[PDB]
């Protein structure tokens, strides 16, 4: 009945585009209805707020309500149910009547989908009647009003697709708040850190750059996480007092020490948050978008990738580059989104560079292991693909890595069945929806490009093809040095091993097998070495040049026909 | 659950064989139960009606119910299923109990296949339990009914094979409502047009001949379409009366004119439906099921020798099935047309199909070959599966030498499996026509008598025949006739077949469009258009 | 047996076996038992498994709660014995297969069916039996 | 159509086809019939499967319970012709495709829509019709 005059517009930031639409669609036909009365125009606009969960929908609808000043009727869907089938409609009939009786008025149906789901699956009689009562109540607004003191019903929900189409048709105005951009997140961070003590090194613009895919709720956790880091020094001092009072692992003792006193509360000095604590806070906070379905960042760096300079240049100029400098690349017409289909013989490093790109781009990473999205139920197999891109867009920039993609988009022959074709078509449409300025970088890897659909390789789709093939003799030297370096002979002996004619067809995996064979040959030599020198555990196994000599003899290339993989 | 005395026996026709069985299997153990009572034997008969959809299954069960007069309980299978799993059996247990409580009674389980499906593949618990509930409710009828009165269960379904064998066994009487024949469709058409005013030219036998593959529902649309055409004259007269009363587009005014009077009613003269409107109505109505070709003998030029052979082995034994059957002339399963390609083998097969008024299916060669072990033979069997259902039907296998090669030692196991399937189906009102240009490669078991043992050679025209064909082609699309003689007698058409002459006419037509285009930059088909058409058309 | 709510369906089975124990000696006839005793392995659900588990519990109480003086026999009939759950099928000590009748059986069946009727002395049931090969 | 009971919804429908027949001739308008008469292949809801049966049965009673010349015509309008049951769309022989309005028609719509509003004098309801060739 009264506005909630405790949250203001200043407390909600980053919604500048959303607040612009809400000015001419909610505020105006609630306070300046006289102009509409002079104009003679009924306002039947049902304003619907939708977007990712945590974007500040509930808070905004309460901040707007407190600012407009007109009578406000907050409605919570679970609180509508009282304990009787007929009483549920009584609560709804007591809202649309009260708003009409107290027009102009604002109705907020928070979590509308909790009582406005799909009626097709609504088997229960009570559930299907609440939707009918709600939808009829909107027509009464258009009828029982002077066409001047309009009543606007505002509904907020994080699942706009769950609304009954009988209801969503009645909500003409739909406001997609979406996720805030880099400029918007800076505004939120400044707004959030307004009652706190801060240092001078805090660059909120820098903080916004390295928090992609965060929403207003997620940015609140980053501030909250940084506050805890600011109090870390005030806990160690509290721990030290407990240690000095008392003459099991260390963390357990800390709980036991603080459990002891529980009454001798000591003053926490009022320190301020530095910039180093904010960087620590961002790492500790996982955004709500990255909670589910996002793979862990691989441990592979460019130091783990030997040679492949041509592939590295293409990857550092099409994916890693645009992620680091989205403005430098967009000046030369390089859009911050790409689709790359890595292909080549097996064992040559297609997955290795994709794991290095995911790790060297510092961006979000989603990995799909072949036909991981297929499900035995109807529609759920296709919904997984659509939901896959529903989070890749929300967490842009994001890297989608389809490993062994020939199993997910096979050639649409007669022997395909009406289950994977429905997924290939869905995957084709989603790749079309990936905008040039969307921020999704799709990487595909397959070792049999002759079995992958040719429709996936068109522009807009995975139209960029990078060939990863067998290394040359000079190329294997970089790879063999890279492999030996990452496991610890020096580097001059590695050139002799890699340039040997017995490694003519070796791929990247074969060179790794060569090193493992030499390592096993060392241990066999060590086992006999420690039996002649002993009959004390001080034996030193070291990979010697003679171990490489017998490793070259017993290792053959895993690739049979190198030219079999150059045909597509 | 009272019997509706709405649809009568007169309103259901063409079921004379069906109505004879239903008299001693439904009427007797519902009205004359006393005779069973004296003998002391309950008569429990579950009558099952099945056939193509639209054959008049639902209507028959309601016409019988209204004539018997006993209590009737219409049951629709989808409405039995309720929101709760246990409520579906509740609906069924409230039916078989009600019939027992209200014996004698008639139960109509319309669309039984919607719930009495095969519980084997119906692995879901509710699906497999409806069938069990149905079967137990029928046993209680045999057990708990009195000796005096019987309860008859009538089931209708268009897919009798989908029924659970535990259920189809409970329906002893099965009536397969096939599709009506020419004699039967005439009875249906007369029954539908019984309360209407008709003219004298209406030949119901002619209507039945030119409506093959139609069912009772389709024939109701044909009657409904002809009735609307019959009222077209009654609307123009109605519009003129409104115009004469009142001195915005025209259709809007017509609505406004008729809104004026309303309560003021003027007489509609009682006109009658002619036969020409019935012929128009049939064309406008597309049956749910192929279609008689539009090619007549006026589209076929010359080929009189081929026509006589075709008019004596196929076309004749269709128009007068009794005149030919009087002298012992069985309708040969078909004709094996052969000759060079492009000479009118498919054209004449479409002409035979049109002067026979039967359905036509055309195969353009090896369309039936499949890489699988069974689908290649199933395509041939499905070809004859529809041909029987739409009898009379003409099956035309064009370039049949790729579908039935000679079963020599070098044949493998893919074409032999197709020849055998085709041989058995030809043994099983279907007129199969085959065409091939290499008769030395077709199996000799096909060309035996009873199978396609009649061979008619359709070959290249010499010179006079092309004149008739070119005149025929030009006549059906609208140069005069003196220029057509010059075109057909030109030495450049030495090897032209029927298709080449058709290609020649299209080339001349295209040459006309080039002339119109240049005329409008600075239409009658002229001789100069034929001049450049002769150059750009080859016999191939 | 099947009811609407959760425990209604399983409580109907428990009432059947408890009533038989209270009425011992008694004969339970579970007609079309394959409808409710289907293989919960392939038929994966929540109610279906609890129906099967209630019959297994029920069929064990009858052979343990009866006072050694009166016995309870459970008779079940089904066209699909393979659709029964093995935990329930194994609980029937006797399986009796009633196949299609032979020529000798068909003659006896006709006489029983043609017992309350009036027949002519010309009727030869041997001819009727021999002309109905695959009749049940 | 929706009632306070699952069976009451058909009562409301059965009170419509009966009223039109009782007050024949009459006009029944099933606006967006497909919204409650969709395909019931995946619609296992009990109410959904009974509306289609009720709709088809109500049309037969029209053909039966009328004084011949007191017909009752049921007119149905829907923007989703694909949701109709093929068992029902076959029973509707006459289909009227309204289509999209032309340039002359769109001018009337624009004038009709801007009828309760305060407008200036420069508004030429002709330029708007020219630049809306795909608007409905």
């Amino acid at each position: 009945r009264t506005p909630p005059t405790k949250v203001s517009i200043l407390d909600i930031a980053g919604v500048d585009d959303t607040l612009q639409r809400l000015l001419k669609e909610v505020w105006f036909p609630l306070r300046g209805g006289e102009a509409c009365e002079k104009m003679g125009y009924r306002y039947d606009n049902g304003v619907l707020l939708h977007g990712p969960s945590g974007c500040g929908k509930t808070t905004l609808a309460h901040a707007i309500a407190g600012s407009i000043g007109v009578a406000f009727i907050p409605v919570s869907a679970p609180s509508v149910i009282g304990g009787t089938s007929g009483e549920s409609e009584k609560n709804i009939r007591d809202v649309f009547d009260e708003a009409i009786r107290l027009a102009p008025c604002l109705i907020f149906l928070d979590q509308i989908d909790a009582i406005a789901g799909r009626r097709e699956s609504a088997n229960k009689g009570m559930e299907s009647r609440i939707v009918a009562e709600i939808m009829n109540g909107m027509d009464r607004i258009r009828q029982n009003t002077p066409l001047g003191k309009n009543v606007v019903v505002l509904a907020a929900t994080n699942r706009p697709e769950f609304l009954d189409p009988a209801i969503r048709r009645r909500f003409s105005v739909e406001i997609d708040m979406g996720m805030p951009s880099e400029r918007a997140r800076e505004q939120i961070l400044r707004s959030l850190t307004r009652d706190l003590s801060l240092a001078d090194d805090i660059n909120f613009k820098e903080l916004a750059k390295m928090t992609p895919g965060y929403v207003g709720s997620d940015l609140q956790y980053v501030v909250k996480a940084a506050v805890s880091e600011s109090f870390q020094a005030n806990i160690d001092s509290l721990l030290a007092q407990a240690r000095a009072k008392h003459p099991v692992s260390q963390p357990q003792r800390d709980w036991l020490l603080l459990e002891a006193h529980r009454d001798e509360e000591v003053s926490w000095p009022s320190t301020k948050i530095t910039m180093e604590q904010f960087r620590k806070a961002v790492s500790l906070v996982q955004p709500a978008s990255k909670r589910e379905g996002f793979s862990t960042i691989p441990d592979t760096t460019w130091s783990h990738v030997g040679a492949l300079e041509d592939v590295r240049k293409k990857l550092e100029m099409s994916i890693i580059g645009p992620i680091k400098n989205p403005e430098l690349f967009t000046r030369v017409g390089i859009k911050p989104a790409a689709g790359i289909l890595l292909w080549g013989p097996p064992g040559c490093g297609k997955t290795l560079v994709a794991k290095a790109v995911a790790n060297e781009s510092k961006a979000n990473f989603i990995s799909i292991k072949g036909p991981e999205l297929l499900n035995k139920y109807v529609g759920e197999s296709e919904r997984a693909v659509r939901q896959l891109f529903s989070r890749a867009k929300s967490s842009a920039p994001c890297i989608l890595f389809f490993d062994q993609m020939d199993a997910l988009v096979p050639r649409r022959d007669d022997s395909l069945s009406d289950a994977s074709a429905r997924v290939v078509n869905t995957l084709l449409t989603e790749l079309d929806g990936v905008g040039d300025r969307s921020g999704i970088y799709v990487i595909g890897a397959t070792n049999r490009p002759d079995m992958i659909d040719e429709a996936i390789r068109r522009p807009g789709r995975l139209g960029t093809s990078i060939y990863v093939g067998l290394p040359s003799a000079e190329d294997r030297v970089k790879i063999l040095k890279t492999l030996y370096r990452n496991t610890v002979t020096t580097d001059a002996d590695l050139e002799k091993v890699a340039l040997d004619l017995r490694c003519t067809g070796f791929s990247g995996a074969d060179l790794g097998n060569l090193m493992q064979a030499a390592a096993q040959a060392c241990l066999e030599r060590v086992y006999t070495q420690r039996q002649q020198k002993r009959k004390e555990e001080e034996i030193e196994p070291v990979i010697t040049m003679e171990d490489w000599e017998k490793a070259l003899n017993e290792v053959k290339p895993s690739v049979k026909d190198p030219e079999k993989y150059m045909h597509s | 659950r009272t019997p509706p005395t709405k649809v009568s026996i007169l309103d259901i026709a063409g079921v004379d064989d069906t109505l004879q069985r239903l008299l001693k299997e439904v009427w007797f153990p519902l009205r004359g139960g006393e005779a069973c009572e004296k003998m002391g034997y309950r008569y429990d008969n579950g009558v099952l009606l099945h056939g193509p959809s639209g054959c008049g299954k639902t209507t028959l069960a309601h016409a019988i119910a209204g004539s018997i007069g006993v209590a009737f309980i219409p049951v629709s299978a989808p409405s039995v299923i309720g929101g709760t799993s246990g409520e579906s059996e509740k609906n069924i247990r409230d039916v078989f109990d009600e019939a027992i409580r209200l014996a004698p009674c008639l139960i109509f389980l319309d669309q039984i296949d919607a719930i009495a499906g095969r519980r084997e593949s119906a692995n879901k618990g509710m699906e497999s339990r409806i069938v069990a509930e149905i079967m137990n409710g029928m046993d209680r009828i045999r057990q708990n009914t009195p000796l005096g009165k019987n309860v008859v269960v009538l089931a209708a379904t268009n897919r009798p094979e989908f029924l659970d064998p535990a259920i189809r066994r409970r329906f002893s009487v099965e009536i397969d409502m096939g599709m009506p024949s020419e004699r039967a469709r005439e009875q249906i058409l007369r029954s539908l047009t019984r309360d209407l005013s008709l003219a004298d030219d209406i030949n119901f036998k002619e209507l039945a001949k030119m409506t093959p593959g139609y069912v009772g529902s389709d024939l109701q649309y044909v009657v409904k379409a002809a009735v609307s055409e019959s009222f077209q004259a009654n609307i123009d007269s109605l519009l003129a009366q409104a115009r004469a009363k009142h001195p915005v587009s025209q259709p809007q005014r017509d609505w406004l004119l008729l809104e004026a009077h309303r309560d003021e009613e003027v007489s509609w003269p009682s006109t009658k439906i002619t036969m020409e409107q019935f012929r128009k109505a049939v064309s406008l109505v597309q049956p749910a099921s192929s279609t008689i070709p539009d090619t007549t003998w006026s589209h076929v030029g010359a080929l009189e020798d081929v026509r006589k052979k075709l008019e004596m082995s196929i076309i004749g034994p269709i128009k007068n099935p009794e005149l030919f059957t009087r002298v012992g002339i069985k309708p040969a399963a078909g004709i094996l047309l052969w000759g060079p390609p492009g000479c009118g083998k498919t054209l004449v097969a479409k002409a035979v199909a049109n002067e026979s008024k039967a359905n036509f299916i055309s195969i353009k060669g090896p369309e039936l070959l499949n890489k699988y072990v069974g689908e290649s033979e199933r395509a041939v069997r499905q070809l004859f599966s529809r041909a029987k259902s739409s009898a009379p039907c003409i099956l035309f296998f064009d370039q049949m030498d790729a579908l039935v090669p000679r079963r020599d030692d070098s044949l493998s196991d893919a074409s032999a499996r197709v020849v055998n399937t085709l041989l058995t189906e030809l043994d099983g009102g279907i007129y199969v026509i085959g065409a091939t240009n290499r008769p030395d490669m077709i199996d000799e078991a096909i060309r035996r008598p009873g199978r396609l043992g009649t061979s008619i050679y359709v070959g290249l025209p010499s010179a006079e025949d092309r004149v008739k064909i070119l005149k025929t082609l030009y006549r059906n699309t609208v140069t005069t006739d003196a220029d057509l003689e010059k075109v057909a007698l030109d030495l450049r058409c030495t090897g032209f077949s029927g298709a080449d002459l058709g290609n020649l006419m299209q080339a001349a037509a295209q040459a006309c469009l080039e002339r119109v285009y240049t005329q409008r930059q600075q239409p009658v088909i002229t001789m100069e258009d034929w001049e450049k058409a002769l150059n750009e058309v080859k016999p191939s | 047996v099947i009811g609407g709510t959760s425990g209604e369906s399983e409580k109907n089975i428990r009432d059947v076996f408890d009533e038989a124990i209270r009425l011992a000696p008694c004969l339970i006839f579970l007609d079309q038992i394959d409808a409710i005793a289907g293989r919960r392995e392939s038929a994966n659900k929540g109610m279906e498994s609890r129906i099967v588990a209630e019959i297994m519990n029920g069929m064990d109480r009858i052979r343990q709660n009866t006072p050694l003086g009166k016995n309870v026999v459970v008779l079940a009939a089904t066209n699909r014995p393979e659709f029964l759950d093995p935990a329930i099928r194994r609980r029937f000590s006797v399986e009796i297969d009633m196949g299609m009748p032979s020529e000798r059986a068909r003659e006896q069946i006709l006489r029983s069916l043609t017992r309350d009727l009036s027949l002519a002395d010309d009727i030869n049931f041997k001819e009727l039996a021999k002309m109905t090969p695959g009749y049940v | 159509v929706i009632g306070g009971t699952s069976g009451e919804s058909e009562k409301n429908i059965r009170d419509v086809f009966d009223e039109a027949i009782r007050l024949a001739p009459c006009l029944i308008f099933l606006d967006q019939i497909d919204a409650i008469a969709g395909r019931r292949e995946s619609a296992n809801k009990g109410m959904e499967s009974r509306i289609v049966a009720e709709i088809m049965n109500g049309m037969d009673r029209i053909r039966q319970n009328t004084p011949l010349g007191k017909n009752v015509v049921v007119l149905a309008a829907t923007n989703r012709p694909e949701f109709l049951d093929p068992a029902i769309r076959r029973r509707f022989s006459v289909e009227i495709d309204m289509g999209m309005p032309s340039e002359r028609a769109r001018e009337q719509i624009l004038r009709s829509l801007t009828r309760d509003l305060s407008l200036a004098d420069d508004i030429n309801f002709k330029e708007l019709a020219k630049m809306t060739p795909g608007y409905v």
Binding site: T84, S85, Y377, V378 | T84 | - | -
Partner: peptide, 23 residues
Amino acid sequence: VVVVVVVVVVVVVVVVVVVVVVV
């Protein structure tokens, strides 16, 4: 008024098949 727990129908699934080739 007391809301009771009511069981409902089950979802449908997909099944793969194997097809022979005469070639």
